[PDB]
Structures are given as structure tokens and as C-alpha cells.
Amino acid sequence: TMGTISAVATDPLSRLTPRPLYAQSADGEAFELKKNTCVSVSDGSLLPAVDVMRDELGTSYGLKLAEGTNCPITFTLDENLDVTGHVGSAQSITADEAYTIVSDADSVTVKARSATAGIWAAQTLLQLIGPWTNSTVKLADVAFIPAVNIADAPRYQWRGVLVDPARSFYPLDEMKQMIDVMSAYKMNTLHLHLSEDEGFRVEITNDGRADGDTTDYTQLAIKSGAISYQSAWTSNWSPAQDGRTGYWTQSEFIELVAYAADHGIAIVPEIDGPGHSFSLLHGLAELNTGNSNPKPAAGEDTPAFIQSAQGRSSLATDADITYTVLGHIMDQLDGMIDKGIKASTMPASELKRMYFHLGGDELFLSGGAGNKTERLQEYLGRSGALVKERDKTTIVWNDGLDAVDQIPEGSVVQHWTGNAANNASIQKLLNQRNGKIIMSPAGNTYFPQRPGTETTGVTWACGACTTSNFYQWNPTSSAGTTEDKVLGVEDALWSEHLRSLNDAEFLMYTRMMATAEVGWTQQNRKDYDNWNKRVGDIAIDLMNRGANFHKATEVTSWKGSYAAVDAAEQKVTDGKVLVGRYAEPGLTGTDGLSFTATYTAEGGTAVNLPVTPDMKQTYSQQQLKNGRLVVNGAHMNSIVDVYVTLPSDVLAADSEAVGRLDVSVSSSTYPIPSDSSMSIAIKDGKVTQTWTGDERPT
Ligand SMILES: [Cl-]
Ligand code: NA
Ligand code: NA
Ligand code: NI
Q1: Which residues surround ligand 2, an ion (CB under 5 A)?
Q2: What structural domains does the chain harbor?
Q3: Alpha carbon separation from 166 to 237, 264, 493 (Å, rounded)
């Protein structure tokens, strides 16, 4: 077979991640999105779903996507929506998140069991439209929703990411960037590890304390916001830079909850104790009492943030003030979560997650009275009772199950270490105490585990925990239980070594998109090789978002993708105008790219135009200096901006000139070239209009 090949968009249904329960092509032509296509909703709680579509498509395709009456696109809330006809004998769904999409050339009909499911339908629709919907510039092509029949719902109700800002703070705007991609893959839970040995990351005020509580809670963020993970206390490849300091103000935290809610994501706070608790002792003089450790130096009210304290924290398990303080922190987080949900337009019934994570990490024992276990059992007994009296379900890590009998009936273990199927404590929780499990086995879900053998990172769980390790497991089987006992899964972003959103995203992506599939897709509809093939498009969307990602060697679908840009919205400078974008992961430069641009005016013959490729940043793998990771060393190349220089002639025509612009790109690093054809109208030295169809839009 001698000749040439030209790149083509993938089949829309073949792209979908997570893979839906049921997804089939329907008869006839695609639905064409127009600037003024409106959307009808049966209920105001579906406007967040439409907002997610507008946030992308307003920029990428110039769509208003305004709310209207009797629109061709409809979102209907149906609390009885039944997708069980697509659930086989070997399958299991949590129906609250169910949606259906039925589309044809004239109409796009979405039914959603919940407001959350509306957002999931929106995310599916944006994957069907394609991987350029997050373009920061308006594209020349029009957007199409293909004719489909989709019925979908998740296997697991709990599909989460733990973020640790306690080791190293993340500003609100970075958290929003994480939320966008989590929502994109139908993750519904953001677990905030708010407190550690090395930091406390949310403002607690003195409003609404219990009668007689004179604790000055303002000092917690003031003192322990100002500490972070210390590079000097490491002897390894950790960056030379300490963790970022800071904390979310109450107003920032409320915004974080609201933004998460508006993207279908509930907040689950963790205030870890009785161990991993130094920030609480450092922050609040009042907690330095009873059997707390380490103690303040003679004359000081708080213990010093020094290397000797590392690994040696315990709250006072024997002191009333410990539970007073936890109760107040719980009430403050609850108040701010309620305010954030109110600010969102999402229902509290869906977005107020009635769970509190106590952690249950083991305390360091120094003083006498009580062994580690007795003190832990007292702590999780009392702190468990705090969560239950607040109408919530207690979560603890594995270490917490030394207190399995003392935490409330119905409590949850977040499993990360060893074999859950063979763990007597876990099986007692699930079988004897009506408990449930959240699966975060380190080897399948811990992002600091290095994603490749060429990378620098944590090695203990897999050597390298690749997309294969993140994809190829069954959480129900790993837990040795039944579907009904498994809430779901969480990835964990621990920040001992993380100093930037860029360096977090390197570890998070694309492994999070494998966890998303494990959370959502039926066991018997999983196919690692198929998921692997779908990463090429996932990556084009991440580059459009400006999100970093590990270019994993085991992924074989990395590709170059070309999009014609609407030059009507682009400035002509010295005859040069942006007409294309070329997204190819891994480019260390543009010298391996060959562009050809041909302009044919009505009345004229083909004229070669000079092409100026512009790539802001090049691709780099991790960088080390003095045996330590450089912050932001690993970063993705930009999308290439493809400029042409229009002839002086055409730009000096005071009469409108219409022409065809053909651009081709060949890459030395991707063997399938792209060919693009766009019509452009030019008047008074400006591009006035572009179109990629056979006929000029009016
Ligand atoms: Cl089946
Ligand atoms: Na998309
Ligand atoms: Na146009
Ligand atoms: Ni780890």
C-alpha cells in the first residue's frame, strides 16, 4: 500500500472516559451547535451543567448556549430515571448519578437522575464534541454533537482525590484547576487533608464556640499556616524548597466548596489525629495539656517547629479541651461547607457529604499512663461520638481500626496498606459493624509513587506505579467483600515533595483518568489497551487546558492534532495572523515540524505563505540539581501557534477578498500528517470571517 495518509478526528463514541454503561451510534446526521443554540432545563439545579458547557464552548466555538424555552437541547431532572435495562447480571450501578443522552440532527435530549448526573451528561457531551472544547481561542470549525443513544451510571458512588495542602499549600485558583479536570472525568469527591505535622490550611475563627470555650482559634491558621514541609530535614531527592506556606481564609474556603459543588464535587474534610497532629499543638496553646507530645519548652505555650518534633506528635487523648477543639473545628467546616453549597446553585441533598475523616494515625507515645492503643481507642471513641452527634459517618485510615469497636457502627475505613481481603479488622468492620470501605491501595492510587522507571519518585509500592497499576484492579475483589460494602476509590496527592500545581499535575495525569474509569466503568466493560488508546485525545484536551501530565512510555496513543483557528478574532500584525494550532505532546522544539500554507484567492492561483510556528514552552522531563528535583523541571510543551503572513497585496485591498487557506503539518515525531482547509474573507487588512464548510455562513 504505497501513497499518503492524513490525520482524522477519532469516532466520538470511542473517546468516552470513563467508558459508559451503554453507548451506541443513533441514525442520521450530527446536531450542529450554532452561536444562538439555546438550552431548556426542567429545573434550576441543572443550570450548573449548562454553565460547564458554556465555560468551554463560549471560548472554543463562540456559543452563547443561553437558557431558553422549547430549545433543541434539553436537560430534564427525573428522580425515577431507570437505566437498569442496561445493567446485566454481572454489573452494579449507583443510580443517583444516572443519566441518558438521546440525540439526532434536530435535538439533544438529556435526562438526569440528579443535578450531579446533569453535570456528568454535560461532561460526556463535551467529550463527544471533541478534545478542542477547552481551546483558549475560537476555532474555525463548528461544533457537532453526534447522533447517540447513551445510558450511563457509575459502579461506585465515591470517586475521589485526596489533596494534601498541609505539607505544601495550594492557592484557591490551583484547587479550581484540579476541580475542573476531576469533574471532566466524573470524579465527585475532593478529600482535603487540612492538617498535618507540617501545616494547618484553613482559617478557624472564634464565632459560635460552645459555652465556656475561651480557646483562641484564630492562632491555628496564624501560627500553623506559617509552617510547611522542611527541605533541610530530608537527605533525599526532595526539592531544595520548603513547602508553600499559607491557608485558605474562610471566604476562600467557601469559594472552594462552591466551585467544587458547581462541578459536581463534594468536599470531605480530614483533621488527622491523634498522630500527624503537630500543627494543632503548634497552633493552639490550649491543646498543650495532659498526655500531648512533644511538650512546649519551659516558658513557652506551644512546641517549637523543629526537626526533633518530626514523627513525635500526639494530641492529649486524656483532655476534654482536645474534643472541645475538634468539635469547634467540625462546626466551622460545616458552616463554611453549608455557605459554599448555598453559593453554588446545587442541592445540599446531593453536595453536603455527611462524612468526616478523623484520620486515626497512631500517636507517638512518650509519657506513661495508657499504651498507644488505649489512648487511640479513647481518642477515636470520643472523636467518633463528635462526628455521630453531627449526623455524619466517621472515616479512618487503616491505623484507626485498632479502635474498630470504639468508633460508631457504620463507620468507614480508607484502606491504603496491605491486603484488605485478608485484614481481620477490615472484615470485622464490614461484616460485624455494618461498615464500608474506601479503596486507596498505595500501589493503585498513591500519586507520589513514581509513574515510570525513568522518573524520580517514591518506589516502595510498585517500583513504578504506571497507568497499568492504576487501571488493572477490581476494588471490590481487592477488599474481599460485596459491591454494597465498597463506597468507591480515592487517589491520594501527598505533598511532601510538591511545590506547584505543575509538579502535582505531572503525578496526577494521566493516572487519575485510569482511577476515574475504575470508579465509574463496569468491571466487565474495562479494557486497559482500549483506555490506553483513549489517552491520545485526553492529552490534546489537557494541553488545551494548560494542564501538565507525565508522558508515560507505556501509553502508545500520544498524537499530534491540528485545529484551524478563527482568524476573524485574531489581530493581523505586520501581515502575520494566527490561523492554526498544533498540539503534540513531547516536542522539545519546532524544527522537526514542516508546515506548508497555500492561499488561493477567488480570481487567483495558489500562493505559498510564510509560516511562523510559535511554541511558548518546550517539553522537559524531570530535572535534578545537587541530587534534588527542580520545581517545575518536568513541564509539557505548549500547543504550537501557527501564523501565516498574508500577502501585502491582499491586505491593501479596500474591497473584500475571499480565499481558501490550506495548511499541512508533517512532524518528525508523529508519523500521521494533518491537512486543514479554511475559507477566509479579508477587508481593510483584517480577517472578517472564516469558515471550514462548503458554503459561507451569512
Ligand atoms: Cl453483564
Ligand atoms: Na471536550
Ligand atoms: Na466563522
Ligand atoms: Ni506515597
Answers
A1: 126, 133
A2: 12-152 (3.30.379.10), 158-529 (3.20.20.80), 561-691 (2.60.40)
A3: 20, 24, 11
Distance 467 CA to ligand 1 centre (A): 25
Ligand 2 centre distance from Cα of residue 544 (Å): 10
Name the closest ligand to CA 687.
Answer: 3
Do you know the residue count of the chain?
698
| Counts of helices then strands in the chain (DSSP H, E) | 17, 29
Cross-strand partners of 190: 161, 267
Cell of 149: 443513544
Q: Pinpoint the alpha helices (H) of 436-561.
A: 442-445, 467-471, 475-478, 501-508, 511-520, 528-545
Ligand nearest to the CA of 12: 2
| Cα separation, 208 vs 632, whole angstroms | 42
| DSSP states along 603-636 | TS--EE--EEEE-SS--B---EETTEEPTT-SBP
Residues involved in catalysis: 362
Instruction: Enter the resolution in angstroms.
Output: 1.8
Give 468 Cα–ligand 2 centroid separation in angstroms.
24
Q: Is the dihedral of CA 504, 179, 229, 460 positive or negative?
A: negative
* DSSP bridge partners of 414: 397, 438
Task: Name 74's bridge partners.
Answer: 40, 109
The residue behind cell 497532629 is 277
- The rounded Å distance from CA 457 to ligand 4 centre is 9
* Euclidean distance between CA atoms 30 and 145, whole angstroms: 6
Report how far Cα 477 is from the mean position of its chain's Cα atoms.
26
Retrieve residue 399's grid coordinates: 491505623
CB 83 within 8 A of CB 90: no
Residues 6+ apart with CB under 8 A from 352: 266, 337, 338, 341
Q: Please name every residue paired with 682 in a beta bridge, in sequence order, or none if there are none.
A: 657, 687
On whether the CB atoms of residues 21 and 153 are closer than 8 A, the answer is yes
List strand residue ranges (DSSP E) for 365-478, in order.
393-397, 412-415, 436-439
Nearest ligand (C-alpha, residue 139): 3
For 642, the 3-state DSSP assignment is: strand
Whose cell is 497507568? That residue is: 467
CA distance linking residue 337 with residue 351, whole number of Å? 9
For 232-342, list the strands marked E by DSSP: 266-273
Q: Specify the experimental method.
A: X-ray
Q: How many Å lie between the centroid of ligand 3 and the Cα of residue 625?
A: 49
Alpha helices, H only, 68-188: 115-129, 172-184
Distance CA 623, CA 634 (A): 7
Cα of 88 to ligand 1 centre, how many Å? 4
The ligand with the least distance to the CA atom of 568 is 3
Alpha-carbon gap, residue 459 to 237, rounded angstroms? 12
Among 44, 88, 93, which Cα is nearest to 67's?
A: 44
CA distance 116 to 122: 10
3-state secondary structure of 480: coil
Q: How many CA atoms lie within 13 A of 481 on its CB side?
A: 27
